[PDB]
mmCIF file of C-alpha atoms and ligand atoms in Angstrom:
data_model
loop_
_atom_site.group_PDB
_atom_site.id
_atom_site.type_symbol
_atom_site.label_atom_id
_atom_site.label_comp_id
_atom_site.label_asym_id
_atom_site.label_seq_id
_atom_site.Cartn_x
_atom_site.Cartn_y
_atom_site.Cartn_z
ATOM 1 C CA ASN A 10 -47.195 -119.305 6.364
ATOM 2 C CA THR A 11 -46.920 -122.312 8.688
ATOM 3 C CA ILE A 12 -43.218 -122.389 9.554
ATOM 4 C CA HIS A 13 -43.911 -121.421 13.193
ATOM 5 C CA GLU A 14 -45.818 -124.712 13.747
ATOM 6 C CA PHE A 15 -42.816 -127.073 13.515
ATOM 7 C CA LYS A 16 -40.147 -127.683 16.075
ATOM 8 C CA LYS A 17 -36.848 -126.292 14.814
ATOM 9 C CA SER A 18 -33.487 -128.034 15.318
ATOM 10 C CA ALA A 19 -30.650 -125.855 14.087
ATOM 11 C CA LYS A 20 -27.671 -127.173 12.012
ATOM 12 C CA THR A 21 -29.246 -130.507 11.399
ATOM 13 C CA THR A 22 -30.462 -132.855 8.741
ATOM 14 C CA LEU A 23 -31.434 -136.535 8.794
ATOM 15 C CA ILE A 24 -29.643 -139.364 6.998
ATOM 16 C CA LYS A 25 -31.261 -142.421 5.372
ATOM 17 C CA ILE A 26 -29.502 -145.336 7.225
ATOM 18 C CA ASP A 27 -32.145 -147.444 5.517
ATOM 19 C CA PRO A 28 -32.243 -147.697 1.755
ATOM 20 C CA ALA A 29 -35.964 -148.502 2.165
ATOM 21 C CA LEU A 30 -37.452 -145.178 3.367
ATOM 22 C CA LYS A 31 -38.243 -142.552 0.704
ATOM 23 C CA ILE A 32 -37.677 -138.795 0.102
ATOM 24 C CA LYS A 33 -38.685 -135.750 -1.878
ATOM 25 C CA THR A 34 -36.441 -132.810 -2.680
ATOM 26 C CA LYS A 35 -37.037 -129.579 -4.488
ATOM 27 C CA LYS A 36 -34.811 -126.592 -5.122
ATOM 28 C CA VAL A 37 -36.681 -123.458 -3.768
ATOM 29 C CA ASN A 38 -36.293 -119.919 -2.291
ATOM 30 C CA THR A 39 -37.150 -119.830 1.420
ATOM 31 C CA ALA A 40 -37.909 -122.346 4.228
ATOM 32 C CA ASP A 41 -41.540 -120.992 4.305
ATOM 33 C CA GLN A 42 -42.101 -122.492 0.891
ATOM 34 C CA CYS A 43 -41.018 -125.600 2.664
ATOM 35 C CA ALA A 44 -43.354 -125.567 5.613
ATOM 36 C CA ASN A 45 -46.415 -124.924 3.409
ATOM 37 C CA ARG A 46 -45.834 -127.967 1.237
ATOM 38 C CA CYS A 47 -45.270 -130.206 4.220
ATOM 39 C CA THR A 48 -48.296 -128.745 5.946
ATOM 40 C CA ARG A 49 -50.518 -129.177 2.921
ATOM 41 C CA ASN A 50 -48.920 -132.485 1.921
ATOM 42 C CA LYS A 51 -49.471 -131.911 -1.825
ATOM 43 C CA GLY A 52 -47.439 -133.899 -4.397
ATOM 44 C CA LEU A 53 -46.028 -136.247 -1.768
ATOM 45 C CA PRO A 54 -46.332 -140.064 -2.170
ATOM 46 C CA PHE A 55 -46.141 -140.203 1.642
ATOM 47 C CA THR A 56 -46.994 -138.449 4.953
ATOM 48 C CA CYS A 57 -44.773 -135.395 5.636
ATOM 49 C CA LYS A 58 -43.601 -135.677 9.238
ATOM 50 C CA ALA A 59 -40.501 -133.440 8.777
ATOM 51 C CA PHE A 60 -38.547 -131.289 6.394
ATOM 52 C CA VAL A 61 -35.061 -129.915 6.174
ATOM 53 C CA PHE A 62 -34.242 -126.713 4.485
ATOM 54 C CA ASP A 63 -30.740 -126.398 2.974
ATOM 55 C CA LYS A 64 -29.711 -122.706 3.047
ATOM 56 C CA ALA A 65 -26.664 -123.443 0.774
ATOM 57 C CA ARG A 66 -28.295 -125.544 -1.969
ATOM 58 C CA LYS A 67 -31.676 -123.810 -1.422
ATOM 59 C CA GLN A 68 -33.271 -127.231 -1.233
ATOM 60 C CA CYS A 69 -36.105 -128.719 0.683
ATOM 61 C CA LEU A 70 -36.059 -132.307 1.737
ATOM 62 C CA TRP A 71 -39.485 -133.605 2.855
ATOM 63 C CA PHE A 72 -39.510 -136.809 4.967
ATOM 64 C CA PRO A 73 -41.916 -139.612 6.006
ATOM 65 C CA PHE A 74 -40.079 -139.858 9.307
ATOM 66 C CA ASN A 75 -38.353 -137.596 11.800
ATOM 67 C CA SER A 76 -35.452 -137.662 14.171
ATOM 68 C CA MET A 77 -37.169 -140.301 16.305
ATOM 69 C CA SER A 78 -37.922 -142.798 13.563
ATOM 70 C CA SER A 79 -35.962 -146.066 13.445
ATOM 71 C CA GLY A 80 -33.204 -146.375 10.806
ATOM 72 C CA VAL A 81 -32.599 -142.570 10.629
ATOM 73 C CA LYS A 82 -29.917 -140.411 12.220
ATOM 74 C CA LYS A 83 -29.169 -136.737 12.641
ATOM 75 C CA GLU A 84 -26.307 -135.330 10.726
ATOM 76 C CA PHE A 85 -24.661 -132.046 11.359
ATOM 77 C CA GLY A 86 -24.306 -129.191 8.876
ATOM 78 C CA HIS A 87 -24.085 -125.399 9.218
ATOM 79 C CA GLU A 88 -26.372 -125.038 6.239
ATOM 80 C CA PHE A 89 -29.239 -127.341 7.414
ATOM 81 C CA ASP A 90 -32.247 -126.519 9.513
ATOM 82 C CA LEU A 91 -34.572 -129.270 10.560
ATOM 83 C CA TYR A 92 -38.256 -128.818 11.155
ATOM 84 C CA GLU A 93 -40.427 -131.590 12.631
ATOM 85 C CA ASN A 94 -44.215 -131.668 12.387
ATOM 86 C CA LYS A 95 -45.616 -131.319 15.971
ATOM 87 C CA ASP A 96 -48.156 -133.939 14.832
ATOM 88 C CA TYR A 97 -45.716 -136.816 14.808
ATOM 89 C CA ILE A 98 -43.855 -135.766 17.932
ATOM 90 C CA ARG A 99 -45.541 -137.530 20.782
ATOM 91 C CA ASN A 100 -47.473 -134.990 22.925
ATOM 92 C CA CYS A 101 -48.156 -137.081 26.005
ATOM 93 C CA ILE A 102 -45.836 -138.858 28.399
ATOM 94 C CA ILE A 103 -44.924 -142.426 29.090
ATOM 95 C CA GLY A 104 -43.950 -143.211 32.678
ATOM 96 C CA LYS A 105 -42.141 -140.226 34.188
ATOM 97 C CA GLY A 106 -41.359 -138.739 30.784
ATOM 98 C CA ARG A 107 -37.657 -139.236 30.604
ATOM 99 C CA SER A 108 -38.034 -139.257 26.803
ATOM 100 C CA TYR A 109 -40.716 -136.617 26.369
ATOM 101 C CA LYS A 110 -39.651 -134.468 23.397
ATOM 102 C CA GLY A 111 -42.786 -132.329 22.844
ATOM 103 C CA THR A 112 -42.646 -128.527 22.870
ATOM 104 C CA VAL A 113 -44.868 -127.490 25.807
ATOM 105 C CA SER A 114 -42.981 -124.740 27.514
ATOM 106 C CA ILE A 115 -45.339 -123.520 30.254
ATOM 107 C CA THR A 116 -45.631 -124.612 33.894
ATOM 108 C CA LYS A 117 -48.851 -125.869 35.398
ATOM 109 C CA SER A 118 -49.804 -122.377 36.703
ATOM 110 C CA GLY A 119 -49.011 -120.647 33.455
ATOM 111 C CA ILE A 120 -45.430 -119.506 33.895
ATOM 112 C CA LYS A 121 -43.448 -119.404 30.702
ATOM 113 C CA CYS A 122 -40.435 -121.707 31.220
ATOM 114 C CA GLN A 123 -36.875 -120.249 31.314
ATOM 115 C CA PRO A 124 -34.381 -121.406 28.629
ATOM 116 C CA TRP A 125 -32.089 -124.283 29.746
ATOM 117 C CA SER A 126 -29.133 -122.292 28.217
ATOM 118 C CA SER A 127 -29.945 -119.318 30.413
ATOM 119 C CA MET A 128 -29.043 -118.565 34.010
ATOM 120 C CA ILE A 129 -31.781 -115.938 34.333
ATOM 121 C CA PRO A 130 -33.864 -115.827 36.453
ATOM 122 C CA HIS A 131 -32.282 -118.923 37.933
ATOM 123 C CA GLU A 132 -28.841 -120.366 38.270
ATOM 124 C CA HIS A 133 -28.657 -124.099 37.742
ATOM 125 C CA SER A 134 -26.329 -126.763 36.311
ATOM 126 C CA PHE A 135 -28.602 -128.568 33.841
ATOM 127 C CA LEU A 136 -26.369 -127.547 30.949
ATOM 128 C CA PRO A 137 -27.722 -128.972 27.661
ATOM 129 C CA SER A 138 -24.245 -130.438 27.036
ATOM 130 C CA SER A 139 -24.425 -132.214 30.412
ATOM 131 C CA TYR A 140 -27.661 -133.900 29.285
ATOM 132 C CA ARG A 141 -27.326 -135.065 25.721
ATOM 133 C CA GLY A 142 -30.266 -137.087 24.423
ATOM 134 C CA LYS A 143 -32.494 -135.445 27.032
ATOM 135 C CA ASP A 144 -33.202 -132.580 24.505
ATOM 136 C CA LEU A 145 -32.848 -129.634 26.877
ATOM 137 C CA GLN A 146 -33.350 -127.175 24.048
ATOM 138 C CA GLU A 147 -35.117 -123.824 24.182
ATOM 139 C CA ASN A 148 -37.358 -123.687 27.210
ATOM 140 C CA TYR A 149 -39.231 -126.943 26.904
ATOM 141 C CA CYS A 150 -40.523 -128.982 29.851
ATOM 142 C CA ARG A 151 -38.199 -131.905 30.385
ATOM 143 C CA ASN A 152 -37.578 -134.484 33.032
ATOM 144 C CA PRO A 153 -33.893 -135.142 32.340
ATOM 145 C CA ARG A 154 -33.068 -137.083 35.491
ATOM 146 C CA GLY A 155 -36.427 -138.904 35.119
ATOM 147 C CA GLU A 156 -37.812 -137.947 38.523
ATOM 148 C CA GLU A 157 -41.193 -138.458 40.167
ATOM 149 C CA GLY A 158 -43.151 -135.428 38.978
ATOM 150 C CA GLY A 159 -42.656 -135.674 35.197
ATOM 151 C CA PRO A 160 -41.348 -132.848 33.022
ATOM 152 C CA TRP A 161 -40.588 -129.587 34.737
ATOM 153 C CA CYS A 162 -38.551 -126.467 33.898
ATOM 154 C CA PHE A 163 -36.973 -123.486 35.653
ATOM 155 C CA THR A 164 -39.420 -120.648 35.649
ATOM 156 C CA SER A 165 -39.055 -117.204 34.117
ATOM 157 C CA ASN A 166 -40.635 -115.883 37.369
ATOM 158 C CA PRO A 167 -37.771 -115.084 39.800
ATOM 159 C CA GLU A 168 -40.026 -115.944 42.744
ATOM 160 C CA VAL A 169 -40.652 -119.490 41.372
ATOM 161 C CA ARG A 170 -37.400 -121.349 40.849
ATOM 162 C CA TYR A 171 -39.171 -124.322 39.131
ATOM 163 C CA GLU A 172 -42.445 -126.100 38.435
ATOM 164 C CA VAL A 173 -43.990 -129.160 36.831
ATOM 165 C CA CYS A 174 -45.568 -128.864 33.508
ATOM 166 C CA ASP A 175 -48.900 -130.437 33.260
ATOM 167 C CA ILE A 176 -48.496 -132.866 30.333
ATOM 168 C CA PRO A 177 -50.929 -135.789 30.071
ATOM 169 C CA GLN A 178 -50.053 -139.387 30.510
ATOM 170 C CA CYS A 179 -50.495 -141.223 27.131
ATOM 171 C CA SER A 180 -52.263 -144.071 28.917
ATOM 172 C CA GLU A 181 -53.519 -144.271 32.523
ATOM 173 C CA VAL A 182 -56.688 -146.355 32.908
ATOM 174 C CA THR B 11 -53.128 -118.675 15.301
ATOM 175 C CA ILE B 12 -56.744 -119.970 15.310
ATOM 176 C CA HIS B 13 -55.604 -123.071 13.310
ATOM 177 C CA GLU B 14 -53.308 -124.623 15.920
ATOM 178 C CA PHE B 15 -56.653 -125.756 17.380
ATOM 179 C CA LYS B 16 -59.225 -128.412 16.613
ATOM 180 C CA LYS B 17 -62.729 -126.858 16.253
ATOM 181 C CA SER B 18 -65.895 -128.645 17.232
ATOM 182 C CA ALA B 19 -68.733 -126.349 15.926
ATOM 183 C CA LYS B 20 -71.792 -125.864 18.151
ATOM 184 C CA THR B 21 -70.213 -127.227 21.276
ATOM 185 C CA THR B 22 -69.054 -126.091 24.717
ATOM 186 C CA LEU B 23 -67.595 -127.647 27.891
ATOM 187 C CA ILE B 24 -69.312 -127.694 31.294
ATOM 188 C CA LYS B 25 -67.163 -128.350 34.331
ATOM 189 C CA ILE B 26 -68.398 -130.710 37.061
ATOM 190 C CA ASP B 27 -65.397 -130.324 39.340
ATOM 191 C CA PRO B 28 -65.940 -126.650 40.244
ATOM 192 C CA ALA B 29 -62.296 -126.390 41.416
ATOM 193 C CA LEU B 30 -60.744 -126.391 37.914
ATOM 194 C CA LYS B 31 -59.923 -122.714 37.147
ATOM 195 C CA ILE B 32 -61.429 -120.589 34.348
ATOM 196 C CA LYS B 33 -60.869 -117.106 32.999
ATOM 197 C CA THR B 34 -63.345 -115.351 30.749
ATOM 198 C CA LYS B 35 -63.442 -112.003 29.023
ATOM 199 C CA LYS B 36 -65.772 -110.178 26.638
ATOM 200 C CA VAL B 37 -63.649 -109.969 23.462
ATOM 201 C CA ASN B 38 -64.502 -109.301 19.770
ATOM 202 C CA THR B 39 -63.616 -112.399 17.683
ATOM 203 C CA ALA B 40 -62.598 -116.068 18.284
ATOM 204 C CA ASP B 41 -59.185 -115.295 16.793
ATOM 205 C CA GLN B 42 -58.514 -112.929 19.757
ATOM 206 C CA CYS B 43 -58.935 -115.803 22.137
ATOM 207 C CA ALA B 44 -56.682 -118.141 20.207
ATOM 208 C CA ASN B 45 -53.817 -115.678 20.454
ATOM 209 C CA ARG B 46 -54.294 -115.086 24.196
ATOM 210 C CA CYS B 47 -54.486 -118.896 24.641
ATOM 211 C CA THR B 48 -51.449 -119.631 22.342
ATOM 212 C CA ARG B 49 -49.130 -117.244 24.205
ATOM 213 C CA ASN B 50 -50.898 -118.014 27.520
ATOM 214 C CA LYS B 51 -50.188 -114.552 29.037
ATOM 215 C CA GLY B 52 -52.531 -113.515 31.894
ATOM 216 C CA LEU B 53 -53.998 -116.978 32.519
ATOM 217 C CA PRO B 54 -52.969 -118.703 35.816
ATOM 218 C CA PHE B 55 -52.757 -122.108 34.172
ATOM 219 C CA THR B 56 -51.877 -123.866 30.933
ATOM 220 C CA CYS B 57 -54.535 -123.026 28.300
ATOM 221 C CA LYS B 58 -55.555 -126.254 26.719
ATOM 222 C CA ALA B 59 -58.823 -125.035 25.273
ATOM 223 C CA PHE B 60 -61.133 -122.184 24.794
ATOM 224 C CA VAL B 61 -64.712 -121.606 23.855
ATOM 225 C CA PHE B 62 -65.947 -118.621 21.891
ATOM 226 C CA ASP B 63 -69.480 -117.417 22.660
ATOM 227 C CA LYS B 64 -70.732 -115.928 19.415
ATOM 228 C CA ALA B 65 -73.836 -114.491 21.085
ATOM 229 C CA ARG B 66 -72.310 -112.763 24.115
ATOM 230 C CA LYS B 67 -69.054 -112.380 22.180
ATOM 231 C CA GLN B 68 -67.251 -113.797 25.207
ATOM 232 C CA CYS B 69 -64.274 -116.079 25.495
ATOM 233 C CA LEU B 70 -63.846 -118.825 28.029
ATOM 234 C CA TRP B 71 -60.355 -120.265 28.549
ATOM 235 C CA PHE B 72 -59.673 -123.619 30.162
ATOM 236 C CA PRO B 73 -56.808 -125.681 31.579
ATOM 237 C CA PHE B 74 -58.655 -128.791 30.271
ATOM 238 C CA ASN B 75 -60.258 -130.145 27.077
ATOM 239 C CA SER B 76 -62.986 -132.667 26.097
ATOM 240 C CA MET B 77 -60.818 -135.683 27.043
ATOM 241 C CA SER B 78 -60.291 -134.421 30.578
ATOM 242 C CA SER B 79 -61.831 -136.199 33.556
ATOM 243 C CA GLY B 80 -64.567 -134.078 35.139
ATOM 244 C CA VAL B 81 -65.859 -132.163 32.094
ATOM 245 C CA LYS B 82 -68.650 -132.719 29.540
ATOM 246 C CA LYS B 83 -69.235 -131.724 25.913
ATOM 247 C CA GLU B 84 -72.689 -130.050 25.382
ATOM 248 C CA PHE B 85 -74.591 -128.864 22.381
ATOM 249 C CA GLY B 86 -74.938 -125.059 22.186
ATOM 250 C CA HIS B 87 -75.709 -123.406 18.809
ATOM 251 C CA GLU B 88 -73.949 -120.143 19.841
ATOM 252 C CA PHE B 89 -70.678 -121.761 20.902
ATOM 253 C CA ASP B 90 -67.577 -123.093 19.205
ATOM 254 C CA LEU B 91 -64.964 -125.282 20.960
ATOM 255 C CA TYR B 92 -61.257 -125.023 20.192
ATOM 256 C CA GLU B 93 -58.831 -127.491 21.751
ATOM 257 C CA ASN B 94 -55.049 -126.959 21.732
ATOM 258 C CA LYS B 95 -53.508 -129.821 19.664
ATOM 259 C CA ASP B 96 -50.622 -130.235 22.103
ATOM 260 C CA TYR B 97 -53.197 -131.825 24.407
ATOM 261 C CA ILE B 98 -55.101 -133.987 21.994
ATOM 262 C CA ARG B 99 -53.205 -137.206 22.057
ATOM 263 C CA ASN B 100 -51.320 -137.550 18.724
ATOM 264 C CA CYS B 101 -50.441 -141.100 19.094
ATOM 265 C CA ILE B 102 -52.526 -144.319 18.807
ATOM 266 C CA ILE B 103 -53.267 -146.934 21.444
ATOM 267 C CA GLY B 104 -53.832 -150.286 19.749
ATOM 268 C CA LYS B 105 -56.338 -150.106 16.946
ATOM 269 C CA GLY B 106 -56.964 -146.429 17.600
ATOM 270 C CA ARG B 107 -60.618 -146.758 18.682
ATOM 271 C CA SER B 108 -60.333 -143.497 20.601
ATOM 272 C CA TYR B 109 -58.061 -141.496 18.245
ATOM 273 C CA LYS B 110 -59.313 -137.953 18.162
ATOM 274 C CA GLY B 111 -56.527 -135.955 16.433
ATOM 275 C CA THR B 112 -56.487 -133.824 13.267
ATOM 276 C CA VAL B 113 -54.461 -135.900 10.808
ATOM 277 C CA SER B 114 -56.201 -136.163 7.421
ATOM 278 C CA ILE B 115 -53.645 -137.584 5.001
ATOM 279 C CA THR B 116 -53.353 -141.320 4.085
ATOM 280 C CA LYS B 117 -50.000 -143.252 4.466
ATOM 281 C CA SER B 118 -49.031 -142.751 0.778
ATOM 282 C CA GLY B 119 -49.825 -139.045 0.980
ATOM 283 C CA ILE B 120 -53.356 -138.883 -0.420
ATOM 284 C CA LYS B 121 -55.696 -136.238 1.116
ATOM 285 C CA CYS B 122 -58.724 -137.748 3.006
ATOM 286 C CA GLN B 123 -62.286 -137.873 1.688
ATOM 287 C CA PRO B 124 -64.517 -136.007 4.218
ATOM 288 C CA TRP B 125 -67.043 -138.273 5.980
ATOM 289 C CA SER B 126 -69.821 -135.716 5.206
ATOM 290 C CA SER B 127 -69.405 -136.498 1.469
ATOM 291 C CA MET B 128 -70.174 -139.465 -0.862
ATOM 292 C CA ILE B 129 -67.653 -138.339 -3.511
ATOM 293 C CA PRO B 130 -65.648 -139.974 -4.989
ATOM 294 C CA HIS B 131 -66.474 -142.954 -2.711
ATOM 295 C CA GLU B 132 -69.985 -143.658 -1.408
ATOM 296 C CA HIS B 133 -70.399 -144.975 2.154
ATOM 297 C CA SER B 134 -72.280 -146.062 5.331
ATOM 298 C CA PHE B 135 -70.486 -143.636 7.704
ATOM 299 C CA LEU B 136 -72.431 -140.363 8.312
ATOM 300 C CA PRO B 137 -71.485 -138.533 11.515
ATOM 301 C CA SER B 138 -74.693 -138.842 13.526
ATOM 302 C CA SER B 139 -75.203 -142.524 12.590
ATOM 303 C CA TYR B 140 -71.848 -143.158 14.288
ATOM 304 C CA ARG B 141 -71.956 -140.725 17.214
ATOM 305 C CA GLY B 142 -69.372 -140.742 19.989
ATOM 306 C CA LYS B 143 -66.843 -141.570 17.227
ATOM 307 C CA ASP B 144 -66.072 -138.042 15.903
ATOM 308 C CA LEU B 145 -66.521 -138.716 12.132
ATOM 309 C CA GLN B 146 -65.967 -135.022 11.830
ATOM 310 C CA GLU B 147 -64.137 -133.179 8.978
ATOM 311 C CA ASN B 148 -61.664 -135.347 6.991
ATOM 312 C CA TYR B 149 -59.869 -136.768 10.012
ATOM 313 C CA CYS B 150 -58.237 -140.131 9.945
ATOM 314 C CA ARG B 151 -60.581 -142.200 12.138
ATOM 315 C CA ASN B 152 -61.362 -145.753 13.198
ATOM 316 C CA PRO B 153 -65.078 -145.979 14.167
ATOM 317 C CA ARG B 154 -65.491 -149.763 14.271
ATOM 318 C CA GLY B 155 -61.975 -150.089 15.604
ATOM 319 C CA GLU B 156 -60.487 -152.472 13.013
ATOM 320 C CA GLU B 157 -57.047 -154.139 12.703
ATOM 321 C CA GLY B 158 -54.711 -151.553 11.091
ATOM 322 C CA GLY B 159 -55.710 -148.333 12.938
ATOM 323 C CA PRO B 160 -57.363 -145.108 11.810
ATOM 324 C CA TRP B 161 -58.146 -144.705 8.138
ATOM 325 C CA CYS B 162 -60.353 -142.671 5.837
ATOM 326 C CA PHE B 163 -61.956 -142.791 2.469
ATOM 327 C CA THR B 164 -59.665 -141.130 -0.002
ATOM 328 C CA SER B 165 -60.231 -138.182 -2.336
ATOM 329 C CA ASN B 166 -58.529 -140.276 -5.091
ATOM 330 C CA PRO B 167 -61.103 -142.201 -7.145
ATOM 331 C CA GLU B 168 -58.694 -145.173 -7.685
ATOM 332 C CA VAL B 169 -58.171 -145.697 -3.952
ATOM 333 C CA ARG B 170 -61.373 -146.260 -2.009
ATOM 334 C CA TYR B 171 -59.725 -146.477 1.353
ATOM 335 C CA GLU B 172 -56.313 -146.580 3.042
ATOM 336 C CA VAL B 173 -55.013 -146.408 6.582
ATOM 337 C CA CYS B 174 -53.158 -143.331 7.761
ATOM 338 C CA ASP B 175 -49.674 -143.264 9.160
ATOM 339 C CA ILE B 176 -50.297 -142.418 12.855
ATOM 340 C CA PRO B 177 -47.682 -143.739 15.258
ATOM 341 C CA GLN B 178 -48.420 -146.095 18.070
ATOM 342 C CA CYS B 179 -47.726 -144.572 21.454
ATOM 343 C CA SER B 180 -45.373 -147.570 21.767
ATOM 344 C CA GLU B 181 -43.382 -146.813 18.656
ATOM 345 C CA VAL B 182 -40.754 -144.459 20.090
ATOM 346 C CA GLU B 183 -38.563 -144.809 23.227
HETATM 347 O O1 EP1 C 201 -32.028 -129.023 41.895
HETATM 348 S S1 EP1 C 201 -32.557 -127.877 41.068
HETATM 349 O O2 EP1 C 201 -33.197 -126.825 41.860
HETATM 350 O O3 EP1 C 201 -31.416 -127.268 40.286
HETATM 351 C C1 EP1 C 201 -33.839 -128.658 40.007
HETATM 352 C C2 EP1 C 201 -35.026 -129.100 40.870
HETATM 353 C C3 EP1 C 201 -36.097 -129.899 40.102
HETATM 354 N N1 EP1 C 201 -36.478 -131.165 40.787
HETATM 355 C C4 EP1 C 201 -37.314 -130.874 41.979
HETATM 356 C C5 EP1 C 201 -38.271 -132.016 42.385
HETATM 357 N N2 EP1 C 201 -39.013 -132.531 41.222
HETATM 358 C C6 EP1 C 201 -39.802 -131.468 40.549
HETATM 359 C C7 EP1 C 201 -41.281 -131.828 40.512
HETATM 360 O O4 EP1 C 201 -41.984 -131.115 41.542
HETATM 361 C C8 EP1 C 201 -38.022 -133.151 40.309
HETATM 362 C C9 EP1 C 201 -37.014 -132.107 39.762
#
């Protein structure tokens, strides 16, 4: 029951710009059944980096790519949920982390981050719509204006308006 | 929740830098430390790792792992080390000499042949003959660091070896 180990993007599937990349699909019952086969990677002529579940056609679509791969695009759909394997979503930062899209949602000192769509505890104007491509979803640490400290978030502690999250540099030698 | 973590049996982490924080508590099983780590409540930092002391039945939580500056692995028969995968780099630099993540599937989807096994392919790569290199479990690895990145022997008798499909850190934005 591994569905809680993927990063969920609602109302979304990915489209094969490229004719070259490949796909598996199976009609099924629940998105769980979909996690488990991506997690286990059985019966797949490729590495499962993401799956979509189609709540209307009850289908799973397992992918050897994700939303960040070249020659692939998101497509909208009320019936689609996308789930990307945390293993192929880069979990360190490059530079100041303008493009960090990992799922760490805790500040350096352990404070659970406050949702970008929320104004509680803290009022702010970093609307997700005002920052498209900067993936200000859920309560993830993000550095949307690409500032000095790397990814930060508003804090769910009313006494701490914000704080850096402590995410490692990919390469600093 | 004790599977979002990479387990090194028989291992713990000593801190040099005695300013890095640490919480410990006498708990009952290793699972009960995973959960407290995973939801990070009551720990004044970001839990990147924990150790379970099977003797003392104690847990030791850390805001660092075995790739952190200022900390050493250490053999201890009574310990087990569990590192949060968000903080083990999931991304390859160059040939992947130092790739220590948990991916175990080849690029065309075939499950990896464990290094501690000569079936179906026989080989010159035991763990302790190649120490420092983490030829642990069935993890995609690159011990001699050679052109196409981490690879493994393959559970499929027709395919001796194949590289895995681990992204470069340079792949994405
Ligand atoms: O201006 S707001 O309070 O709405 C957001 C403030 C966050 N910034 C503060 C300075 N660094 C944070 C790192 O300490 C960059 C982001």
